[PDB]
Write an enzyme that holds these catalytic residues in place. Structure first.
Site, PDB file in Angstrom:
ATOM      1  N   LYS A 175      -4.697  -9.739  -7.967  1.00  0.00           N
ATOM      2  CA  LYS A 175      -5.627 -10.830  -7.690  1.00  0.00           C
ATOM      3  C   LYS A 175      -4.895 -12.130  -7.371  1.00  0.00           C
ATOM      4  CE  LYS A 175      -9.117 -13.558  -7.429  1.00  0.00           C
ATOM      5  NZ  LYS A 175      -8.209 -14.692  -7.104  1.00  0.00           N
ATOM      6  N   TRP A 203     -14.643  -2.246   3.556  1.00  0.00           N
ATOM      7  CA  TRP A 203     -13.531  -1.358   3.863  1.00  0.00           C
ATOM      8  C   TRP A 203     -13.535  -0.124   2.968  1.00  0.00           C
ATOM      9  CZ3 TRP A 203      -8.941  -0.064   1.081  1.00  0.00           C
ATOM     10  CH2 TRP A 203      -7.990   0.631   1.839  1.00  0.00           C
ATOM     11  N   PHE A 240       0.829  -1.201   0.000  1.00  0.00           N
ATOM     12  CA  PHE A 240       0.000   0.000   0.000  1.00  0.00           C
ATOM     13  C   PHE A 240       0.866   1.255   0.000  1.00  0.00           C
ATOM     14  CE2 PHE A 240      -4.460  -0.013  -0.161  1.00  0.00           C
ATOM     15  CZ  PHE A 240      -4.947  -1.201   0.348  1.00  0.00           C
ATOM     16  N   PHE A 267       2.377  -8.403 -10.253  1.00  0.00           N
ATOM     17  CA  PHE A 267       1.621  -7.221  -9.862  1.00  0.00           C
ATOM     18  C   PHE A 267       2.497  -5.972  -9.882  1.00  0.00           C
ATOM     19  CE2 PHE A 267       1.737  -4.754  -5.899  1.00  0.00           C
ATOM     20  CZ  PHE A 267       0.711  -3.861  -6.124  1.00  0.00           C
TER      21      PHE A 267
HETATM   22  C1  JF1 Z   1      -6.144  -5.363  -0.441  1.00  0.00           C
HETATM   23  C2  JF1 Z   1      -6.699  -4.405  -1.162  1.00  0.00           C
HETATM   24  C3  JF1 Z   1      -7.571  -3.382  -0.493  1.00  0.00           C
HETATM   25  C4  JF1 Z   1      -6.473  -4.352  -2.650  1.00  0.00           C
HETATM   26  C5  JF1 Z   1      -6.897  -2.988  -3.204  1.00  0.00           C
HETATM   27  C6  JF1 Z   1      -5.777  -2.039  -3.617  1.00  0.00           C
HETATM   28  N1  JF1 Z   1      -4.450  -2.399  -3.091  1.00  0.00           N
HETATM   29  C7  JF1 Z   1      -3.490  -1.399  -3.597  1.00  0.00           C
HETATM   30  C8  JF1 Z   1      -2.096  -1.662  -3.041  1.00  0.00           C
HETATM   31  C9  JF1 Z   1      -1.640  -3.059  -3.428  1.00  0.00           C
HETATM   32  C10 JF1 Z   1      -2.680  -4.100  -3.027  1.00  0.00           C
HETATM   33  C11 JF1 Z   1      -2.262  -5.488  -3.499  1.00  0.00           C
HETATM   34  C12 JF1 Z   1      -4.075  -3.757  -3.537  1.00  0.00           C
HETATM   35  C13 JF1 Z   1      -4.052  -3.782  -5.060  1.00  0.00           C
HETATM   36  C14 JF1 Z   1      -5.046  -4.796  -2.991  1.00  0.00           C
END
Ligand code: JF1
Ligand code: JF1
Ligand code: MG
Ligand code: MG
Ligand code: MG
Ligand code: MG
Ligand code: MG
Ligand code: MG
Lengths: 306, 306
Positions: free
Chosen positions: A168, A295, A74, A140
């Site tokens: 994902k 969330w 994050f 990713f």
């Molecule tokens: C666990 C999450 C809330 C996802 C939504 C956005 N974030 C951004 C930072 C990197 C994470 C893997 C995710 C993409 C996952």
């Protein structure tokens, strides 16, 4: 913004409070925050909370690993917004051999030894399952700075790209690791179609609630790293409507993906194919989808732009 | 069954719909060449004059029958083109173009030729200036029907741009003005381009949603080129990776957003002091098209029985 009815009920890990204090406390101590305002904004985001919503049935002694991993991802995700595609790439690529453990970290650079000690501790707890998270993470990372973000996309081409950008595959591997849920290669091949459908839900739901934050970022941060790449943007272009209108449409689309999820699972059960492990896995995916939305609905990260 | 989301639009029907329908249907039943009695009954069941009266409710009483005849023969030709190739279909339409202008005499042994000829002759006899303004919009539509872009991959945005010609937005706009005697200056017609483009998306997608089952079957029995499946339902279903039924529900929500945008552009046009009395009738007329098209597509046997 009023979301259409869902049948997915969100669940949260029981140890969410004490793990949050543990993980947030770790980063508040080691991570290089610029100032106190940034430290408050970090805690207010609740990165361990969303993790506990993503994997509410994680093993009590493994949930903190998932919280650490998502937290640092994050933080990096935000850092890349002030970099170019080139700078962002060099930043991520340097962390990849360090994640593997092939390269020792610079212990004067927080992001390096935090990443290193994390994967080292994860391999010590469960070596086999930890290694299976590596490549999904790298996939990713390399998608975050792909120049395809700057090029025009359709809805389909975007959802295909965001499957990597939303991580994902890493979230799925993290879920298995956190639950100790081992699956055979053949088992993972059966839920491949369900995984792809779950990705679209996680992506768009995030896009809806985080649009205003990403809109502001595209106007104030780096023109490349902070570029506006989202389904809300793209659907608004394709159909020539406002971003707010695109959100209402995308939300109905998310419910259809929930409907498809139930249908795909039902077919998996009709045929003698839903193993006990697969039954736990697909339930976990539903926890990710419902947990992500809960969330995203409430987190300060998306509600206060400042 | 599919439940349509709420709309503020109230569909209106021309008060002479009963007489004109019996009149025009009678004409085509005397003159047009149907393969059998089954096709003759199915022709009446479609109600090609009913949709015209729903499209142009505030048309002049002595001009509404012209619109019913034009849309009816275009409907019949549209179905014939599905059994041809793009090359055959083009040759079919192109031969009827100078006949529509009145430059070439029709073959009195061929129904489609003298029906079109006598139609455009009677239209120019009633109102020469306004009837001539429908020619090129019609030809634009006729040449779009056999456009080879139908056999090309299209996104949602590219499809909606193409469909503006294939759904015949301009021809429906010119026909409406003709039937109402609504003359507009070139300045006025330029101010409402965005409203026209937005209205075009509504007419197209609403038609796509209800006519999908018909066109799906056509793609399986109809000539491979002329009967190729070209619809937003199929495009959204493959891009969002959902069922066609799921695509219908989402597209229908989008159509409601286009209704909101219509009200938005109209109010904005008025707030800028650009809404002339003639323009007020025009944008209101476009509303009758969108709502009228939906009403007919919901109830016609053309779409419900295949
Ligand atoms: C666990 C999450 C809330 C996802 C939504 C956005 N974030 C951004 C930072 C990197 C994470 C893997 C995710 C993409 C996952
Ligand atoms: C008047 C309508 C119902 C529109 C929807 C489809 N039809 C097909 C035949 C030709 C018409 C101009 C139209 C495109 C218009
Ligand atoms: Mg981000
Ligand atoms: Mg990101
Ligand atoms: Mg986001
Ligand atoms: Mg057609
Ligand atoms: Mg047709
Ligand atoms: Mg259609």
């Amino acid at each position: 913004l009023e979301p259409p009815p869902s049948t997915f009920q969100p669940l949260c890990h029981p140890l969410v409070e004490e793990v949050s204090k543990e993980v947030d406390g770790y980063f508040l101590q080691h991570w290089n925050f610029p100032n106190e305002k940034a430290r408050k904004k970090f805690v207010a985001a609740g990165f361990s909370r969303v993790t506990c919503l993503y994997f509410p049935k994680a093993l009590d002694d493994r949930i903190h690993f998932a919280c650490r991993l998502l937290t640092v991802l994050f933080l990096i995700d935000d850092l890349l917004e002030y970099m170019s595609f080139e700078e962002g790439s060099a930043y991520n690529e340097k962390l990849i051999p360090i994640s593997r453990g092939d390269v020792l970290p610079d212990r004067s650079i927080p992001v390096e030894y935090i990443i290193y000690d994390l994967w080292e501790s994860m391999r010590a707890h469960d070596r086999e399952m930890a290694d299976e998270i590596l490549e999904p993470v790298f996939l990713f990372m390399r998608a975050q700075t792909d120049r395809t973000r700057a090029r025009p996309m359709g809805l389909g081409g975007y959802l295909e790209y965001r499957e990597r950008d939303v991580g994902k595959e890493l979230l799925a591997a993290l879920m298995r690791f956190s639950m100790g849920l081992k699956l055979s290669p053949s088992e993972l091949q059966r839920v491949r179609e369900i995984d792809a459908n779950c990705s679209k839900h996680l992506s768009v739901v995030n896009d809806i609630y985080s649009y205003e934050k990403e809109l502001y970022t595209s106007k104030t941060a780096h023109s490349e790293g902070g570029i506006l790449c989202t389904s809300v943007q793209i659907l608004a272009q394709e159909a020539d409507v406002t971003a707010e209108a695109a959100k209402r449409v995308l939300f109905v689309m998310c419910r259809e993906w929930e409907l498809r999820h139930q249908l795909l699972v039902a077919r998996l059960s009709a045929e003698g194919l839903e193993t006990p492990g697969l039954a736990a896995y697909v339930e976990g995916l539903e926890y990710q989808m419902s947990g992500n939305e809960l969330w995203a609905q409430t987190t300060l990260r998306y509600s206060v732009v400042v």
